[PDB]
Design a protein around this ligand. Structure first.
Ligand code: ADP
Ligand code: ADP
Ligand code: MG
Ligand code: MG
Lengths: 236, 236
């Protein structure tokens, strides 16, 4: 009756816009749905610090868990790693609810241009690295395969998507430190870039710096690693 | 060393703006602070339903409780009832944290113009009535007295405020169905006025209808009363 909807897709792809549109159609069909995402909590702090991400994450999972007892939930978050998608499916699993992964995609050119339009809050170079490195959902686990893959440069038919999701809802549900280090070093890089307003060339060197640093680290303690990373950017 | 700051004041008075300014100055002083308010969760649903309010309230308090373990928290909410201020103080008392109530005020005319400015999302006559019936913090209980009273029609010295709060945070800490029905009947009224686009004369009828209704109810369980109120507005 209640379902968990898990969005996944890169920054600028249109997750927030899609969530809002999908929620409006669902509510028009008398479904009680809430849209929840990490940016809810993250943007409630006046500044970003790496040490906030743990509270942001858990607070987000908590609200989803609480919500999914009474309401459909649409999870509006990049969900860049399969371990994130697994953590969310485990919430549905806990309350025996169905779930549907909706993967939104657009070409890199489109994502960059949308980024430029939004005032390049994330550096273009970082979205480009994200796009190159993204493992498309379902590439490894059957439980990770999307219910819908949606091309956000093409027409999207919300009624159809609502219809399919509400059908799915009546079906029977059947069913990492490296990800942390990868994710937080990328966020630190982005903060540094925006904070120090780095020129294009410097942006490139810092993205490369991170790459080389992750090559070394792979060949660990998450905090020690991220602390060394900040120290590295400062030195550099 | 951590503190709960509880805002209180009518719609349009400048809570959310004040919160962002104060969080900025606190963070500039290396304080870890988060701004939380029931609208985070209320605005995450695509429409408003009365049945959501309990979830909203509880989810809000749970985020505050969780946050106050590690961060200063600024509570950005109307906090119209002293019962709401009591619940928030009790979270501070639970963790033995200092708290400060900050009462924000502005004249009715300024509230209306700001309301108009922003599109009259809450009917002006409802603002007027809230202004009329508002009980200023500390009217009855000593634990309810404002640490600070702020006139948002004048400039605000956030440096002084932060200094006063940091000083306060180093001190040793020392420590309802009628409200629900009052609150939700107002929200229902506001939502009918907007959804129905009532003319100004019908608005005043409906406002009076709520007043008359609340009289009769004082002479109960909240769900049934609220369903009847809606039935009354539909009839009327
Ligand atoms: N389907 C779409 N078609 C065209 N533009 C879109 C679409 N969805 C979102 N946008 C635009 O792309 C930008 C990023 O949208 P947003 O929903 O904020 O993406 P995300 O939440 O994935 O970061 C916004 O400017 C939005 O207006
Ligand atoms: N101190 C102030 N002086 C002038 N305008 C203000 C002040 N504080 C807020 N405003 C303006 O008043 C309107 C409502 O402010 P907001 O902070 O959203 O109030 P609240 O959160 O109390 O409803 C906004 O359009 C805002 O820009
Ligand atoms: Mg988004
Ligand atoms: Mg506000």
């Amino acid at each position: 009756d209640i379902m968990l909807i898990i969005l996944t897709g890169l920054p600028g792809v249109g997750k927030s816009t899609f969530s809002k549109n999908l929620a409006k159609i669902l509510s028009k069909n008398n479904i009680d749905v809430i849209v929840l995402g990490s940016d809810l909590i993250r943007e409630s702090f006046p500044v970003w610090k790496e040490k906030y991400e743990e509270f942001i994450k858990k607070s987000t999972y908590r609200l989803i868990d609480s919500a999914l007892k009474n309401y459909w939930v649409i999870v509006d978050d990049t969900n860049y790693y399969n371990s994130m998608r697994r953590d969310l499916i485990n919430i549905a699993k806990k309350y025996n609810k169905n779930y549907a992964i909706i993967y939104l995609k657009a070409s890199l050119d489109v994502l960059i241009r949308r980024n430029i339009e939004r005032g390049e809050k994330i550096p273009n170079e970082v979205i480009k690295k994200m796009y190159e490195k993204f493992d498309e959902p379902g590439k490894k686990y059957k439980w990770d395969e999307p219910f819908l893959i949606i091309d956000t440069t093409k027409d999207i038919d919300f009624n159809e998507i609502a219809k399919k999701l509400i059908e799915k809802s009546k079906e029977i549900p059947k069913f990492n430190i490296s990800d942390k280090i990868d994710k937080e070093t990328r966020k630190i890089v982005s903060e540094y870039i925006k904070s120090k307003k780095l020129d294009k060339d410097k942006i490139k060197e810092v993205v490369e710096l991170r790459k080389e640093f992750l090559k070394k680290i792979k060949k660990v303690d998450a905090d020690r690693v991220l602390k060394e990373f900040k120290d590295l950017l400062n030195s550099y």
